[PDB]
């Protein structure tokens, strides 16, 4: 039900290098940091649209 | 003089039918060849009788699972 | 767009024909000393290498320019050196006239199918080509050319032969041809191939015989400039040297036998520049004796570093990062929406300030440097999307870095805090996994630049995450000295801390407002605090656990449990309830590494944020009541009165004699000796157990006529550096001082010192000090010590070695192993080595001292 | 045998630990001396020159610098003669006579 470590970490750097070349950030409003720590408050609220398919 | 068999560090030695093997090869979704592989020069294999094509079924005890099955091919 | 595999073979000539740029032709170099452009074997349409552009249509100047492939027609084929032995066990293998692989139907049908059940392995599937191999060429009757007589191969370095019929009982060596035995190659279907070492697709059998021979890009033959010619390009002028005359002599008039010498001689260079250091093959050297090195010598033949100094006051997960350091160090932020102000106000400080940049990188990608010019001007309209370079901030991803690098805990993620000075600060506790002190260490510090790569040490690397070794079931990242001695201080059976103290120094961690500092357990000698109560003052509301302490031994063991089937009147058995500490003391068995006991509990129930909270709150709680209330060690911590000096002194006396008597009896040839040893290790081995079963009583007698309640003794028994062994050594004596093994023998021809007489064995005679550090050594102890001192030196230095080595083996040997998706540790070429890992599938960092789930535990949990 | 002659302590780290090592305070190094003055003197004394000898067992056997120059009559007497020669500063304080026993 739930993520390893590793997809985290990678899930995180997608979004985070996602938020850099630009796509605005869903739902963050009141902020001032670097792209990682908003996907990373992005990831804390479960609103990261990255999933990981796991091949099973 | 008894023999071998289940002793000091033997584990359960069994032979698998052709349906236990065709479901297990097919669980682990890997070919024949990629099993670990016991030689028909191999003692317990030659006091099981074992043919260069069977797959031994191996049940050890582990201090840290208890009980464990491990599976290898007889070859030379 | 990456690579998924690479797929080895053998180049057919189609593709060196047809991946050339040019056919080279003209056998020369540059000339020369000015002018370095020719039509054959230099940038003829092939390669760019000096500040001029010109190339093959690719244009491409000389800056970033792949090179570029060429090609020679070989006037005749030549047998490749590096298949020469596999072109043998092919030919004498197979059928001439036939194709075939000299095999039975049945043995082809049941090969192949025992070839297939070894396709992977590389190891075993050599074991059956010789088989293979061997069983063919004991045959003569094959069954694809109504069998005609084959004439066994000879061979080497290069040649092939065939011990022929024509006359009778005659066996003459017909010689073969290059020619002949490709054509003979070329008649064996891709049907046998499988059967062989070969492919009929990556790798035909004819192509072992080189028809054209590639030449390698101008790029891969650089001129090394002093020019210093390449050897590569020097063979291959010989080379084509030879094949021009060829094909010169071949087109005119054939006298057959000139043809014959011109083609060996052909061969012999191709043989020479596919590998120099060849067998039977006179290396060809350069004009001075030195061999030239070709093909087969070719293939073969953003950080910080400072001391650092500790930082009790900063999170266990950040590091001090001296600014100066910090300014150096930059990080690439692409500028968006949320920190638009915040890097213009970087770049408009300049490289300068604190909070300034050193460069910018706009779109196009051009660096610009900040330097020079102004931070005016150029801090303009940056628009989104551009990338500013800012010096370090407060919170960055950092890895930290100390060498050597034994386990993985050597290298960790940190949280940069920008410090004045010059040292890198590490946390405390976070000292064992990088196994650094003080005295003079220095350590390495890395800037990662790619997002991806930043969060992924963030996420992955960062301190709170790695507290417990993989090594073991148990924390690694724990109180070390002081942690311990001063949760001992807090957590005493008197320990009485006026509102002064813990008021004023809980502001060291945190946590009261209401319900939390409540409400001062003792009123009756004063209003004070509990230390068990302050202790308790961090622990969440529902751990309940018991372990013994430290000083749960020796007829003070005792026990006197009871279960639940509230007071307190107990001290040993550690009973903390609820975040109440009930009963215990804090120690190296409460707190510290490699324990397993407590840490452990509040990181595997709750693992990350409160972890990391409980480790950096005790340390500076721990730290001040040391410091607040004053911990020392003085001389007189080891002194004892007269009165086990004395004894001391009596004691030593009679191991004395006790060895006399044992050496009285070996000269008289009194026998006893032991079952196994030889006579003379009797004697020796007798002695030292004397000696040492000596030395621990006089240990033994050391421990009582000291006050165990004073601070040095407290450390000991405590969890700060501790050790019964060495407190002998101090106070009693040290010991036998031992070399490799034997007593200290190597000195003079009849003795090891001259202060002895020729023979003595006596206890003094062959290295026994008497006295501890505290009374002095002797002159004579003094060497002594020198002597068995210098084994410490030799044997940790020395350990080195094979420690190194051994684990740089298995390390080069698991490092493909992972644990797939299916939970099974796979090897990289698709081999089960282990049906799910460990057996179980529980990763060692994450199960309770090897068990998989510590049942008991669990149970118990019903609250 | 480095007692005096090498320091026990002073031994530099890492691999040169132990082979590279520093001479004592109370140690001096042979100067240079002439085999000419020894010789003489030696025969002088009693060495009986090997131009001559069996010897074995002459009781005896001498030797200067591994080369064996003779023999004499009885040994403590010779060592003891030239110590105690060096003694009253009759011949170089750089000569070493030894006895060994077997
Ligand atoms: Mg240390
Ligand atoms: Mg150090
Ligand atoms: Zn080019
Ligand atoms: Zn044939």
Known sequence: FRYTRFEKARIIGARALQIAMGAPVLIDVPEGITPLQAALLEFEKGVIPITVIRPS | ?76 | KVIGSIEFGILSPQEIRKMSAAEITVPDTYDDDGYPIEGGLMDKRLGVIDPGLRCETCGARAGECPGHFGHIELARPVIHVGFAKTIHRVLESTCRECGRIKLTDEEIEEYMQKFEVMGDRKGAVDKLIKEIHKKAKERMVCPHCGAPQFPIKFERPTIYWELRKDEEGNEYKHRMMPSEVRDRLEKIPDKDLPLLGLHPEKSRPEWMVLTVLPVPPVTMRPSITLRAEDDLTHKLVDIIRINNRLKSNIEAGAPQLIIEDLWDLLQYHVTTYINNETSGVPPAKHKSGRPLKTLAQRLKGFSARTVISPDPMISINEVGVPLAVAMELTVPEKVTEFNYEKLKQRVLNGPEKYPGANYVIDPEGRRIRLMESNRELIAEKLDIGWTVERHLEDGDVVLFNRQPSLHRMSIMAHRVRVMPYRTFRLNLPVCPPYNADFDGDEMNLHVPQTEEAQAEAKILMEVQNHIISPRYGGPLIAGIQDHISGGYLLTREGAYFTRYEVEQMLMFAGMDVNELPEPDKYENGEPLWSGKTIFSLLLPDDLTIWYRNKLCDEPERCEALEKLIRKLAYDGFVYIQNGKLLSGAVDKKAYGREDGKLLDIIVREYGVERARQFLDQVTKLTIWVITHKGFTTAIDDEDLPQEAIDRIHEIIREAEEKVQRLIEAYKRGELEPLPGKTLEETLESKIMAVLAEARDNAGKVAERYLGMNNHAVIMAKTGARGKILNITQMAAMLGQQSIRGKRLYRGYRGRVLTHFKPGDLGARARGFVTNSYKSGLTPQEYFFHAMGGREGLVDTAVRTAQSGYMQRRLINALQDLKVDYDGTVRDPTGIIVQFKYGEDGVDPMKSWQGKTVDVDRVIVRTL | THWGRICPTETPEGPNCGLVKNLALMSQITTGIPEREVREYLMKMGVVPIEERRPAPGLYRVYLNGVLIGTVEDGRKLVERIRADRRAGKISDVINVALYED
Request: charged share 30%; net charge neutral; proline share 7%.
């Open chain 2, 1 to 76: 003089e008894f023999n071998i068999f289940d002793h000091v560090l033997v584990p359960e030695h069994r032979i698998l039918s052709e349906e236990e093997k065709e479901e297990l090869l097919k669980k682990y979704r890997i070919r024949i060849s990629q099993l670990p592989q016991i030689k028909a020069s191999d003692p317990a294999v030659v006091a099981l009788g074992a043919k260069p094509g069977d797959v031994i079924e191996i049940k050890r005890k582990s201090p840290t699972a208890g009980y464990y099955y491990y599976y290898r091919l007889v070859v030379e």
